Design a protein around this ligand. Sequence first.
Ligand SMILES: [Mg+2]
Ligand SMILES: [Mg+2]
Ligand SMILES: [Mg+2]
Ligand SMILES: [Mg+2]
Ligand SMILES: [Mg+2]
Ligand SMILES: [Mg+2]
Ligand SMILES: [Mg+2]
Ligand SMILES: [Mg+2]
Ligand SMILES: [Mg+2]
Ligand SMILES: [Mg+2]
Ligand SMILES: [Mg+2]
Ligand SMILES: [Mg+2]
Ligand SMILES: [Zn+2]
Lengths: 122, 86, 203, 53, 119, 105, 50
Amino acid sequence: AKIKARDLRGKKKEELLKQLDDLKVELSQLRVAKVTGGAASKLSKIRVVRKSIARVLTVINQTQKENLRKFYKGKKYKPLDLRPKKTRAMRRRLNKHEESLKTKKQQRKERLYPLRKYAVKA
Amino acid sequence: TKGTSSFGKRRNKTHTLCRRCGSKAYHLQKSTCGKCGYPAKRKRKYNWSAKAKRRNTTGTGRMRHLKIVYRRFRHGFREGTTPKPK
Amino acid sequence: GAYKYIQELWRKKQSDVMRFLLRVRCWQYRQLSALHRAPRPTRPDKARRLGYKAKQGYVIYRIRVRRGGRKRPVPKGATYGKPVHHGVNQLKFARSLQSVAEERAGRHCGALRVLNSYWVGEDSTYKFFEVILIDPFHKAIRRNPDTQWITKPVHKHREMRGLTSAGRKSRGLGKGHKFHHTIGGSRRAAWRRRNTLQLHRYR
Amino acid sequence: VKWPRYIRLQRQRAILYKRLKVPPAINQFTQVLDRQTATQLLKLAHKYRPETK
Amino acid sequence: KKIRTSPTFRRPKTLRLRRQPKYPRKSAPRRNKLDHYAIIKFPLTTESAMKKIEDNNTLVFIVDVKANKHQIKQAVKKLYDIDVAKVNTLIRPDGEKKAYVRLAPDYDALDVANKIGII
Amino acid sequence: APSRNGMILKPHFHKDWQRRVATWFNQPARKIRRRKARQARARRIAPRPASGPLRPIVRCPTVRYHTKVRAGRGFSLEELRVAGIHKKVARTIGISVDPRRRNKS
Amino acid sequence: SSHKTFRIKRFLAKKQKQNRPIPQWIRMKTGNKIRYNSKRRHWRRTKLGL
RNA sequence: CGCGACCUCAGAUCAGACGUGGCGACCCGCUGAAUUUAAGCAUAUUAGUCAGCGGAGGAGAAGAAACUAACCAGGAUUCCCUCAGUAACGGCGAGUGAACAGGGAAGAGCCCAGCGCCGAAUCCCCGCCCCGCGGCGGGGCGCGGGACAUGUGGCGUACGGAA
Ligand SMILES: [Mg+2]
Ligand SMILES: [Mg+2]
Ligand SMILES: [Mg+2]
Ligand SMILES: [Mg+2]
Ligand SMILES: [Mg+2]
Ligand SMILES: [Mg+2]
Ligand SMILES: [Mg+2]
Ligand SMILES: [Mg+2]
Ligand SMILES: [Mg+2]
Ligand SMILES: [Mg+2]
Ligand SMILES: [Mg+2]
Ligand SMILES: [Mg+2]
Ligand SMILES: [Zn+2]
């Protein structure tokens, strides 16, 4: 009766939706049993069903977002949620290409007068 | 008359609950808080009351987003990667 | 080139040509709003000398500021204290009006960054300055090594912290005997150095 | 018509240029070449147009 | 030659285009968090609710505070395969929304109450 | 109040000096950090001298000393021209060069 | 007041739910130092000065 | 009598970006007192200090002389010791009060406008192809657009530069 993500990874989307619907129906029945006295065995299944629902929804969301970012992999413009989210300042940071960019004057200076290795007392 | 008799006619309230700071300081007629200054964009604070600043500062609340930032920096702000699968 | 001639013409302000042009420009500017975007630099040579370059991402604004001094922000009298601090009328602001125009231009354009400003006209009650601004996120600015320094976060709001040319003069910093203050970072840095008791471990 | 402020400004600056004693340095450009010579000048200039994109 | 009929100069109406984004702001639309199962929490089994069900031919449920009467009616119809005459809702002095679901005369509240399990 | 021949003293403690007291308990840690940085910098340039570029011979102004000889900031351009070393090349080989220093003697 | 707003009603509901006493089985825990709720609010004193 | 360029000026749920607030121990720019001392008190002192406002970073500011000196000269900025409780300021009262040189920690220098020579030799945006693309770059193919002669880029800046 245990629901594991390993089996849910390969299942089709419609099967996962049907499993989610069945779990939600079971959770509603468990709530009805809870408010009508019920039993300890029935009441302990509420957490199990809630965690199964969470697992199914997590698998659905992870698969959907992986496919979506696969689709946008290569496009210049991507949805904001798919963009990397490091920090407010780090996204305003330079592109790492302009930092290495050097003007012709700087390249001329470095090429003409490079820093050389030397030793003394000999 | 100015004492016990006057306290009888305290019938209508002048302050309500502010929706930005949560304190019962929102002035109804002036539409201003005076604890945080809700209509003003900037929060109300002063250096002549350090205890008031300590009561409502960064460390007092949940820190729901900043606590994750601390650990993410502590590991290196890595994004879009997973540990080696078993 | 023509820029030398333009500069020499602008040095002869008392001449009839320059005074006529300045009067017409002052009237036209006085007929406009206190802060509006100017499409082209009125003085191309001065803008080039101050650092403006005819490239995308360079913007200028014309700002009108009231002339005169600064009276004390108090009620009628009410300078409660010793008669030393009774001065209300004949007291003057430490910063210059050009720095105020730069500050207002930077305040209005938070995204842009103020580079420098120059003088174009003045009335008895109004002064007009052209403030040069640069967009820090335009690809023409990011990809140029000579201008990508201003895109760094350490240069946010230069006019607010007195790092522009107009704001630097009010700080009273320089080399030589004539200052002897700001001999550290600034006046306050020197004051802190001269007003700290260095208590060593061994005294 | 109560014109917008920019239309009134651009008309009033021309009115001022008419009213004020314009110095000869600026007034010189009011004397412009006539049409018959201008069209010949343009005809000659069209032959020596600089290379475009 | 267009004459100015009126002495007033108003701003002409210029062409404005409809937004055509190059990329969506977010990758996927948000899934609804008020599905037919989240709206209905649990039926009420109190003595007053039991008498209401037995006599008035209604059903008593505990509902999410954000739900509307149309949403409650549709959720009950989809869940219990029933047709609703009307719904009366109230907010209890504890933060929970209480709804009385009047059943159509064709169906019986006692039978569906037995089917769902409350009695 | 004075009392039977003490010195007239004017301590400079009329401001809020206790607010700006600078202790020196950081001194040994500062010295250790400086030594570690110096050793790391020396290791980074393995064959080059740890002190840095060669410094010129300089005589001091202010007739008080008038005779001591210390190290200068850099060799003047005239000295480089006489010695036959390019000013831009010299800084890449470990020779200090500054262009402000004149040459009177 | 019988003319309360939604926010005030939610606040009153939360206070009423918080007014309940501490359950007994909490006392049986290993590391427990709590004997009573100590935050019970009565409607005669401590008049909840909204 | 309308169309076609240009200059100034508006409208956008137009395409793509950017700023807003918080913290604020350290930092920068303003504004800015009175308790107190003078055995009273008004200049002074408290004090460019507290209070108030604005703006950042991991440091900030400053910074490579329109300098110091008057010597047989030194040589960016920052900090430590000393100069020195000194020169000087001050109802010359109370009190306030630096700088140079010297010894150290560290040490790094440079770029424009203008002046001029190169056919704008320059830059931005959109389409396609190849690489990698989770701090969106490089090359090529586009009589595809725009910016720019009211001046972009290359050489070149006081230590001289160009041919
Ligand atoms: Mg260049
Ligand atoms: Mg000045
Ligand atoms: Mg050393
Ligand atoms: Mg009472
Ligand atoms: Mg006194
Ligand atoms: Mg006394
Ligand atoms: Mg007194
Ligand atoms: Mg003073
Ligand atoms: Mg600087
Ligand atoms: Mg020095
Ligand atoms: Mg001594
Ligand atoms: Mg040029
Ligand atoms: Zn508030």
